[PDB]
Amino acid sequence: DLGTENLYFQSNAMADFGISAGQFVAVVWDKSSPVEALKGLVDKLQALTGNEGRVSVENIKQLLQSAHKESSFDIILSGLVPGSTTLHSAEILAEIARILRPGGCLFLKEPVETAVDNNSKVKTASKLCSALTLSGLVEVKELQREPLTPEEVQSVREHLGHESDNLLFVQITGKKPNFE
Ligand SMILES: [Hg+2]
Numbered sequence: 463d464l465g466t467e468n469l470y471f472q473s474n475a476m477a478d479f480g481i482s483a484g485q486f487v488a489v490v491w492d493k494s495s496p497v498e499a500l501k502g503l504v505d506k507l508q509a510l511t512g513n514e515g516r517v518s519v520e521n522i523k524q525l526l527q528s529a530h531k532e533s534s535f536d537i538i539l540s541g542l543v544p545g546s547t548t549l550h551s552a553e554i555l556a557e558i559a560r561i562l563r564p565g566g567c568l569f570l571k572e573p574v575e576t577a578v579d580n581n582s583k584v585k586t587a588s589k590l591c592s593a594l595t596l597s598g599l600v601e602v603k604e605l606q607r608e609p610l611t612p613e614e615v616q617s618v619r620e621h622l623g624h625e626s627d628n629l630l631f632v633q634i635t636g637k638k639p640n641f642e
Pocket of ligand 1: 567
């Protein structure tokens, strides 16, 4: 759909997410991910990575149990299926770090609060960055900030049971270091 087309073109055919021929990529989705957007994105990733690469598609609630090989992914994309509104727990970030290879990169999108609210599980941008660091990632950087569309606002209501006036999307990246 249009959301996925926008994602594809604006990221240089996903080159800006490190997607290219031969890359091993995992795409993490959840029930907030529109099915057509997920299928559309997977189709594009399969075309880009080709026969020598790999696209593994994982629901966030199945990721831990899927028990992928340690250090087997070049790129992991999470929360990025257009329309998704997904929160990433410390446990999920740690598992992502485990299955990335050293030098592998996570690109993550998560709706965050502009200010701290201890009544909701939504984080701030700062706390989310620290979560990536504690999971073991390095070169942790914020790449983009976006407002939510009305549908994504509804999605946060429906799927995260949360209502706020400071909900922005942040896109963050982090890299797995070699073991020390
Ligand atoms: Hg990268």
